[PDB]
């Protein structure tokens, strides 16, 4: 009458999926890393109306433990998609239906206690309809955790049953830096709360406030902030091939002085202005001034040889951080700009090709993880951008069709967090897709550690087995987990 099973972090559990074969879980992680798993529940006969869920400490040798304080629990909320995202090529969405995505937190981060009052509450819950309920479990490994094996439990209980499963965790003898190696720019347009920034930083994502009106050292020390934008927006975009004269060298220096002097600074100058060759000399004029002031120029455009020199005589490109879609990738031009000292980042939106990972709810969950980590590393890319995180509809917990344009509908476009009000909290809550992006950032970190230990070629051979390019990446979470384990076991070996 009470069927319980586990699923890996990037395995989608549908409401109608059959019970799996294991109720235990075996995980592996470094210090300073998250690993996650899911507990799925089904009532194949009747109803349990009052279901609770708890976890224990993870016990290691003797007295040794990882506290349950390091585990974060949520109940998955399913949202109904009535209109598919675009269907093209071989990378297709899974069809209209119920999708798990919003995460109902057991604990309000502001109180460290359960919410009350919410329209939706994590626990207790009812198990109905033969229809699955799913608990998401995050484990954060403490930076001081001794390497070795730890075991704890989860307990599912109701008025008519109780089932207990094992959580096995092996902690490897290495640590992910607090400051992530992968840089990012995720934009926030409407939610000005400190809690919204904080929710992103906790998932290893760097964010910038967009569209601010005229009216951090802590976040660095706590969350390892690794870059910051200065916010001189030229206003030039895909529809506006026009640019004003640049801020002056000392104007750029003045904005920069509001940040710590050790923090990597960029400027998001212009957006998708690639077709406007009109703008090359103005771009070079902006670049020369940023360069004199020690600031990187970031534009969402593909490398063009005309901009590989800023006209200052130094040889330096006019764009320092080239931000491209998967479909724009050109091996020869990317190798040229990497070789001369630039960065290339990836970004994603809509459904613009037949083959690339796509960022909508109705695609395979793996697509949010595979881009920042394995594919970026295989192609030498060092960052990720996303245009918006808070693009909510009027009914954000029930309607995720966030963009309708040109006969197409997009489910989750520009939307990675949900407002807290519906669950009785102030401030936003994560989605399952945000957890995948976090995991990809940690995947990127594994490869970076191996490069730094002098094992770049082997690391990239492993990276090419699951994420070699934008066309031939794995759709199988089991194979991705395998690849990651190979990396972690090698690092562990090298550090012992
Ligand atoms: Mg349609």
Author numbering: 9 to 223, 232 to 512
Q: What does the article say, verbatim?
A:
Beta-N-acetylgalactosaminidases (β-NGAs) hydrolyze the different β-GalNAc linkages of various glycans to modulate the length, combination, and abundance of glycans. Despite low sequence similarity, the crystal structures of these enzymes demonstrate that all enzymes share a prototype structure and have diversified their substrate specificities (oligosaccharide-releasing, oligosaccharide/monosaccharide-releasing, and monosaccharide-releasing) through the accumulation of mutations and insertional amino acid sequences. The overall structure of these enzymes is similar to that of CpNga123 and BvGH123, which consist of a β-sandwich domain at the N-terminus and a (β/α)8-barrel domain encompassing the catalytic region. Among Groups 1–4 and GH123, the DE motif is located at the same position, suggesting that these enzymes adopt the substrate-assisted catalysis reported for GH123 MR-β-NGAs.
Surprisingly, Group 1 NgaCa displayed strictly OR-type enzymatic activity and acted solely on Galβ1-3GalNAc-β-pNP. NgaCa in Group 1 had the simplest structure among the enzymes analyzed. The active site of NgaCa possesses a cleft shape that allows oligosaccharides to pass through to the −2 subsite, enabling oligosaccharide binding and OR-type β-NGA activity. Furthermore, three characteristic tryptophan residues (W197, W218, and W249) are located in the subsites −2 and −3. A docking model of NgaCa with oligosaccharide suggested that these tryptophan residues may play a role in a stacking-type interaction with sugars located in subsites −2 and −3. This structural feature indicated that Group 1 enzymes may act on the inner regions of longer sugar chains, in addition to disaccharides from the non-reducing end (e.g., Galβ1-3GalNAc-β-pNP). By contrast, no inhibition was observed in Group 1 OR-β-NGA even at a concentration of 100 μM (green). This difference in the inhibitory activity of Group 1 enzymes can be explained as follows: the monosaccharide reaction intermediate-mimicking inhibitor (GalNAc-thiazoline) does not bind tightly to the substrate pocket of OR-type enzymes. The increased number of residues could potentially reinforce substrate recognition in Group 4 and GH123 enzymes. Additional structural analyses (comparison of crystal structure with AlphaFold2 predicted structure of NgaCa, comparison of apo1-form and apo2-form of NgaCa, and comparison of GalNAc-thiazoline-bond form and GlcNAc-thiazoline-/apo-form of NgaAt, NgaDssm, and NgaP2) data are illustrated in Supplementary Fig. 13.
